[PDB]
From a paper:
S is the major surface glycoprotein on the [name]-[name]-2 virion and is involved in viral attachment to target cells via the interaction of cell-surface-expressed angiotensin-converting enzyme 2 (ACE2) with the receptor binding site, at the tip of the receptor binding domain ([name]), in the S1 fragment of S (Lan et al., 2020). Following attachment, cleavage of S releases S1, allowing a major conformational change in S2, exposing a hydrophobic loop that executes fusion of viral and host cell membranes, releasing the viral genome to initiate viral replication (Walls et al., 2017). In-depth structure-and-function analyses of 27 potent [name]-binding mAbs isolated from vaccinated volunteers following breakthrough Omicron-BA.1 infection reveals that they are focused in two main clusters within the [name], with potent right-shoulder antibodies showing increased prevalence. In summary, we have presented a structure-function analysis of potent human antibodies induced by Omicron BA.1 breakthrough infection in [name]-[name]-2 vaccinated individuals.
We have determined structures for five mAbs within the neck/left shoulder cluster: Omi-2, -9, -12, −25, and −42. In terms of overall pose Omi-9 is an outlier, being perched upright on the [name], whilst the others approach from the back. Omi-9, which shows reduced neutralization of Beta and Gamma, positions close to residue 484, which is mutated from Glu to Lys in Beta/Gamma and to Ala in Omicron. Antibodies Omi-9 and 32 perform poorly on Beta and Gamma and may be sensitive to E484K found in these VoC but tolerate the E484A change in Omicron (Omicron shares N501Y and K417N mutations with Beta whilst Gamma has N501Y, K417T). Overall, the potent antibodies form two clusters; the first, at the neck/left shoulder, includes antibodies that bind the back of the neck (e.g. IGHV3-53 antibodies), and those that bind more upright on the left shoulder (Omi-9); the second, on the front of the right shoulder is seen in the full set of our early pandemic antibodies, but does not include any of the highly potent antibodies in that set.
Numbering used by the authors:
A (entry chain L): 2 to 94, 100 to 110, 112 to 214
B (entry chain F): 1 to 124
C (entry chain H): 2 to 103, 108 to 224
D (entry chain E): 333 to 370, 374 to 527
């Protein structure tokens, strides 16, 4: 049994943040919400769907509607930026959602994407690594998909978490490992980076 | 929960008499110490009289001792206050009160759980 | 209420580890104690619980017969003996008390347990050959791939510290092999590719590896 | 000519928690009821105080504990509530007196006196004079707790956290309940 929450939500200061958590057992199971800031243990912020622990700011509230529960932060403050986890149980013989990063400062910015092919010397070493470098994106969440010619490729992909840059935008990198024979046998490979519902694609080809 | 209702109050001439009565709900009246308090305007509730379960310790406030007689009829769930030789200073709201316990501090209002709404006695 | 975890670190697969939680600010001799973990990128997972006297213990099927929970009420400390640790056990482990209102009450800051094995290894260094970055801007991106090293970190400079503007060294990826890779890129004028030499200087002190890779504009 | 040990009960430096209320058995002694019974909450039931010096009893039980001010009204026959049902119950035909006084200067600490405890949950009500010191995890749901503090499985005891800044309804009150027993046996506790 699983609880589903979005990987990321962003809001401007003063707006109302909403984070949802869905699960088939939620109708007759209580939900709980935890806040976690870097380096710290989680902190309970809502319990039993909608009750607030006595030390938590009253701008935190919770609500239930069947198979979805919502954590609402009204008049959101910079200090509310954190990871939030929902938690419940299965309806048989404890489960946490996967977490939502809530970001609470500048215009949205699409990623710059640079894709590099394997070098001749790596091919000589009987290896091949394609390198997709992703920078200057904001908010700080992307998904990466790779293609061999037109076909999706999932094996051999390693992608970093996004990390904040000195300009408050974000960077990430994705690596595709191939054999030299795979690299040479396709017409091209592509890295496709999706940000805020829009995709940026770069393609490289063997020499 | 016990309910208490006073009757027998009203206007009377100085030197006159009145019998206040107070009737309780329930079938365990015998288990209650019964008391009378009164309250003149601007003053606190002042202890008047109390009677134990057996009738056998009776108690009186200083200023009514000798003039007032408290008695109980368990068969009628009723406590009585015979007030003789009434003086203008006896004018007040008279409250019936009841408790399971007999207090060493029998004059304290806080020692009685149950209170009537009270009835006006006026002496002219 | 204070919960201080310890005993977290590196451990190779098949080995054992013992965590410890040091409770303070409540009669730890009457309350029940929890262990919760959270693997990287995953959700919360309840591990085990113990009663007030240590007599009754309950685990999760993912850890049954492989973990053991105990306590020492004299020392006010909670234990979790983790035998035969797999890579799935790599997580941030929290201890938790017992306080609700009508089961979670208070969580510790958590210690991290890393189940790995990989050994020290110097990087291979490959060129990321110049590629058009901004056509309108007249720039190119070129770089070095610093591949298959362990442990972190590596230091990268360009032209022995003479080239500092336009440098972006990306955080490393941890590959399924247990080795790291990173990339460092410099954005330069495209017109400079035939005339200026670009060399990345890579230092991986744990392996005593210090190499310089010239990144030529060629395939 | 032993004298009854009332000083040891009223003037004890430390009182027991209400859930683990203490009882002192007093027998075969002379008592100065009238001299020791003259800001105290004093309620007697089934017996008059001015008559205790004239009566002999088989045994006199001295129960002492600490509750908060708003709960003193429960230490009485025919009362309901957390203290009466789950901590210290007096029978409906109770024969004795209850004594209580504000002990805010003795049992309240600035940082909170969490030493005094009370029972919050229990499956059934206490019988008269029943003392339950069990601290088993209370099952409020269907699943067996097995000594696990979790959902619908809570610890049955809580703290009073007596602080001097609280109101009178939350200030500590030391309670002494004297039971006057007269079964068969010989009557040995005679007042004088």
């Amino acid at each position: 049994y699983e609880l589903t929450q979005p990987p990321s939500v962003s809001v401007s200061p003063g707006q109302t943040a909403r984070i949802t958590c869905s699960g088939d057992a939620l109708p007759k199971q209580y939900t709980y919400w935890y806040q976690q800031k870097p380096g710290q243990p989680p902190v309970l912020v809502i319990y039993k769907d909608s009750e607030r622990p006595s030390g938590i700011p009253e701008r935190f509230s919770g609500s239930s509607s069947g198979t979805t529960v919502t954590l609402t932060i009204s008049g959101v403050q910079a200090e509310d930026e954190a990871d939030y986890y929902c938690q419940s149980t299965d309806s048989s013989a404890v489960v946490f959602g996967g977490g939502t990063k809530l970001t609470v400062g500048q215009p949205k910015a699409n990623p710059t994407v640079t894709l590099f092919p394997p070098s001749s010397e790596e091919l000589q070493a009987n290896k091949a690594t394609l390198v997709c470098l992703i920078s200057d994106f904001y908010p700080g969440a992307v998904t990466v998909a790779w293609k061999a010619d037109s076909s999706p490729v999932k094996a051999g992909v390693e992608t970093t978490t996004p990390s904040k840059q000195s300009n408050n935008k974000y960077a990430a990198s994705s690596y595709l490992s191939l054999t030299p024979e795979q690299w040479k046998s396709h017409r091209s490979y592509s890295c496709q980076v999706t940000h805020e519902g829009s995709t940026v694609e770069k393609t490289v080809a063997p020499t | 929960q016990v309910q208490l209702v006073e009757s027998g109050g009203g206007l009377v001439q100085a030197g006159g008499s009145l019998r206040l009565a107070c009737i309780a709900s329930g079938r365990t009246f015998h288990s209650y110490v019964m008391a009378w308090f009164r309250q003149a305007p601007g003053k606190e509730r002042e202890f008047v009289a109390a009677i134990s379960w057996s009738s056998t310790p009776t108690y009186y406030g200083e200023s009514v001792k000798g003039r007032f007689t408290i008695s109980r009829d368990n068969a009628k769930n009723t406590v009585y206050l015979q007030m003789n030789r009434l003086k203008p200073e006896d004018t007040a709201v008279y409250f019936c009160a009841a408790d399971r316990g007999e207090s060493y501090y029998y004059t304290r209002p806080t020692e009685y759980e149950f209170w009537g709404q009270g009835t006006q006695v006026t002496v002219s | 209420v204070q919960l201080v975890e310890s005993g977290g670190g590196v451990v190779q697969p098949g080995r054992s580890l013992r965590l410890s939680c040091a409770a303070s600010g409540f009669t730890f001799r009457t309350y029940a104690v929890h262990w919760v973990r959270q693997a990287p990128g995953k959700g919360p997972e309840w591990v085990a619980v113990i009663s007030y006297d240590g007599s009754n213990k309950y685990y999760a099927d993912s850890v049954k017969g492989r973990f053991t929970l105990s306590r020492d009420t004299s020392k006010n400390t909670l234990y979790l003996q983790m035998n035969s640790l797999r890579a799935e056990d790599t997580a941030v482990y929290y201890c938790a008390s017992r306080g609700d209102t009508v089961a979670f009450d208070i969580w510790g800051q958590g210690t991290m347990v890393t189940v790995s094995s990989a050994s020290t290894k110097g990087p291979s260094v490959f060129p990321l050959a110049p590629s058009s970055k901004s056509t309108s801007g007249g720039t190119a991106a070129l770089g070095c791939l610093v591949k298959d090293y362990f442990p972190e970190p590596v230091t990268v400079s360009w032209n022995s510290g003479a080239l500092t503007s336009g440098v972006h060294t990306f955080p490393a990826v941890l590959q399924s092999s247990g080795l790291y890779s990173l990339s460092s890129v410099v954005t330069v004028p495209s017109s400079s590719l035939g005339t200026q030499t670009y060399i990345c200087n890579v230092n991986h002190k744990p392996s005593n590896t210090k190499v310089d890779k010239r990144v030529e504009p060629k395939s | 000519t032993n004298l009854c040990p009332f000083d040891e009960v009223f003037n004890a430096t430390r009182f027991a928690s209400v859930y683990a209320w203490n009882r002192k058995r007093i027998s075969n002694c002379v008592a100065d009821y009238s001299v020791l019974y003259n800001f105290f909450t004093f309620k007697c039931y089934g017996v008059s105080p001015t008559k205790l010096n004239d009566l002999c009893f088989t045994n006199v039980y001295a129960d002492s504990f600490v509750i908060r001010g708003d709960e003193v009204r429960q230490i009485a026959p025919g009362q309901t509530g957390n203290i009466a049902d789950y901590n210290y119950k007096l029978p409906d035909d109770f024969t004795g007196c209850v004594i209580a006084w504000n002990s805010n200067k003795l049992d309240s600490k600035v940082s909170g006196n969490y030493n005094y405890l009370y029972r919050l949950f229990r499956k059934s009500n206490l019988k008269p004079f029943e003392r339950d010191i069990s601290t088993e995890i209370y099952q409020a749901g269907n699943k067996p707790c097995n000594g696990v503090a979790g959902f619908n499985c809570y610890f049955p005891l809580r703290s009073y956290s007596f602080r001097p800044t609280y109101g009178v309804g939350h200030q500590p009150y030391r309670v002494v309940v004297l039971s006057f027993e007269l079964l068969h046996a010989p009557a040995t506790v005679c007042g004088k």
